[PDB]
């Protein structure tokens, strides 16, 4: 058996399941960096406003092209002018690129190791591919980076803690920003005011001798190749979502929803048009442009527009998630972690909604890290994961008929040490409460697929509600965990309900 439960064909997906969007318009909780009156299918969006406006403060991104981005001369010079000068040089050897990046990053001249960049260019690529890199790709990237003040003309607010706020921008604006991140031009983000933000500059991508660095680089250059050659025409929305009230889980009278569970397939392919879970670090993107190459990092590499979330998304608190709609997949891959390789360029065939966003919605929810395995059965811990997932799944002011299924898997398992069987149930309950069906990918674990199916069907047949199940979870803690383990969760739940 390759899958179990409800056929995946019967689950809701976008755009089919969706109601029409309201007119796109800027407001106090929605930043829109393009001319909405001029947004048309197949046309590159026009930036709004027309001319660059700069803000340099603690509420907005600090743009490398700011008049306030200054450097020591002791007189004070325009660092943006320095950046233009440094990057407009001919590169024919990797050291030239390292030298260029360090011209406006002088304090990091010893700290920043560029070994992986040098090794990629010199010891991985063949002569012809190296030539395409320095004659065509890098110069095109520089040019898109340097167009920044003409492309990203509107200040970008930080999505700070507790904010419920969205930023909608064009793929083209994202590409200019990421190109700057590659050349490490973002001021004040190196080493401080941004200790609660992820890194954005790509300096850590260039360090060390991990065998996975070449595969990261190929993945990113495939993106850069494509977006600098032919500007993408769509939009991407980033939404920071906070909930103020969470359910009384013990009393929740909601029934369980449907489940499709399978040990084959992937969220990104088989989960088309569904709410796709990213097993996030609380610093979104995790190790994407350093070391780290599991689920989050892979998705951020194949859909690089996700990476720009790190420019403006503060670390997630327990009640928060980040929702990103409209990122495009640019690469295919195989393997995972130390076996991960870039395979080929991907032509994303996703339809676009009425805001010209690809019909791909990804939610970043960060699981807890458990030092000790039994820590996660503590009720405070279970409740936290339930509320985290619920926040990720809930769409206030949307009726269930218009909500796609959630496509997820073994959230928080592996390095963070979650129990897959407990996490499955927790996601099932959260999705039930948010009135969404669940499509669960076990990634090769056939035994886990049958176990999740069997538990779900068992509880559905017995008409147990979210509350009934949560109460069993608390019983497990109180009877089997706190005085220690002895009996596993699912066996406990079967015997407990059978009586």
Swiss-Prot record:
Free-text function comment from the UniProt entry: Poly(ADP-ribose) glycohydrolase that degrades poly(ADP-ribose) by hydrolyzing the ribose-ribose bonds present in poly(ADP-ribose). PARG acts both as an endo- and exoglycosidase, releasing poly(ADP-ribose) of different length as well as ADP-ribose monomers. It is however unable to cleave the ester bond between the terminal ADP-ribose and ADP-ribosylated residues, leaving proteins that are mono-ADP-ribosylated. Poly(ADP-ribose) is synthesized after DNA damage is only present transiently and is rapidly degraded by PARG.
UniProt KW keywords: Acetylation, Cytoplasm, DNA damage, Hydrolase, Mitochondrion, Nucleus, Phosphoprotein
The family this protein is said to belong to: Belongs to the poly(ADP-ribose) glycohydrolase family.
GO terms, molecular function: poly(ADP-ribose) glycohydrolase activity
Organism lineage string: Eukaryota, Metazoa, Chordata, Craniata, Vertebrata
Tissues/organs with expression: Ubiquitously expressed.
Any GO CC annotation of this UniProt entry: mitochondrial matrix
Enzyme Commission (EC) number: 3.2.1.143
Name of the protein in question: Poly(ADP-ribose) glycohydrolase
Amino acids binding substrate: 267-268, 281, 295, 336, 410-415
Keyword Protease: no
Binding partners and assembly: Interacts with PCNA. Interacts with NUDT5.
Domain remark from Swiss-Prot or TrEMBL: The PIP-box mediates interaction with PCNA and localization to replication foci.
Gene name as annotated: PARG
Active site: 278, 296, 297
Region spans: Catalytic: 154-336
Reactions catalysed, as given in the entry: [(1''->2')-ADP-alpha-D-ribose](n) + H2O = [(1''->2')-ADP-alpha-D-ribose](n-1) + ADP-D-ribose
Record organism: Homo sapiens
BP terms from Gene Ontology: ATP generation from poly-ADP-D-ribose; base-excision repair, gap-filling; carbohydrate metabolic process; nucleotide-sugar metabolic process; regulation of DNA repair
């Amino acid at each position: 058996k390759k899958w179990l439960g409800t056929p995946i064909e019967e689950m809701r997906r976008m755009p089919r399941c969706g109601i029409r969007l309201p007119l796109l318009r800027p407001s106090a909780n929605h930043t829109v960096t393009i001319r909405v009156d001029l947004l048309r299918a197949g046309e590159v969006p026009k930036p709004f406003p027309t001319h660059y406006k700069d803000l340099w403060d603690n509420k907005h991104v600090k743009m490398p092209c700011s008049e306030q981005n200054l450097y020591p001369v002791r007189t004070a010079g325009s660092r943006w002018e320095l950046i233009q000068t440094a990057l407009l040089n001919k590169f024919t050897r990797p050291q030239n690129l390292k030298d260029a990046i360090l011209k406006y990053n002088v304090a990091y001249s010893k700290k920043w190791d560029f070994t992986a960049l040098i090794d990629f260019w010199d010891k991985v690529l063949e002569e012809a591919e190296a030539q395409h890199l320095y004659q065509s790709i890098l110069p095109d990237m520089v040019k898109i980076a340097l167009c920044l003040p003409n492309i990203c003309t509107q200040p970008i607010p930080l999505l700070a803690a507790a904010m419920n706020h969205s930023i909608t921008m064009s793929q083209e604006q994202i590409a200019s920003l990421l190109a700057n991140a590659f050349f490490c031009t973002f001021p004040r983000r190196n080493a401080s005011e941004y200790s609660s933000y992820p890194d954005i500059n790509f300096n850590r991508l260039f360090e060390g001798r991990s065998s996975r660095k070449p595969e990261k680089l190929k993945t990113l250059f495939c993106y850069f190749r494509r977006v600098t050659a032919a500007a993408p025409t769509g939009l991407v929305t980033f939404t920071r979502q906070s909930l103020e009230d969470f359910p009384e889980w013990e009393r929740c009278e909601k029934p369980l929803t449907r489940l499709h569970v399978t040990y084959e397939g992937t969220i990104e392919e088989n989960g088309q048009g569904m709410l796709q879970v990213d097993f996030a670090n609380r610093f979104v993107g995790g190790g994407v442009t350093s070391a780290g190459l599991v689920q989050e990092e892979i998705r951020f590499l194949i859909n690089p527009e996700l990476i720009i979330s790190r420019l403006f998304t503060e670390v997630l608190d327990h009640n928060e998630c980040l929702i990103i709609t409209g990122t495009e997949q640019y690469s295919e891959y195989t393997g995972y972690a130390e076996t991960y390789r870039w395979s080929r360029s991907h032509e994303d065939g996703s339809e676009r909604d009425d805001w010209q966003r690809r019909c791909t919605e990804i939610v970043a929810i960060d699981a807890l890290h458990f030092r000790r395995y039994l820590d996660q059965f503590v009720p405070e811990k279970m409740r936290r994961e339930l509320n985290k997932a619920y926040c990720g799944f809930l769409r206030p002011g949307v009726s269930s008929e218009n909500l796609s299924a959630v496509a997820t898997g073994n959230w928080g398992c592996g390095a963070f040490g979650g129990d897959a069987r407990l996490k499955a149930l927790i996601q099932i309950l959260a999705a039930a409460a948010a009135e969404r069906d669940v499509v669960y990918f076990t990634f090769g674990d056939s035994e886990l697929m049958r176990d999740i199916y069997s538990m779900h069907i068992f509880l559905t047949e017995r008409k147990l509600t979210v509350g009934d199940v949560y109460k069993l979870l608390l019983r497990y803690y109180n009877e089997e965990c706190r005085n220690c383990p002895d009996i596993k969760l699912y066996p406990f739940i079967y015997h407990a309900v059978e009586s």
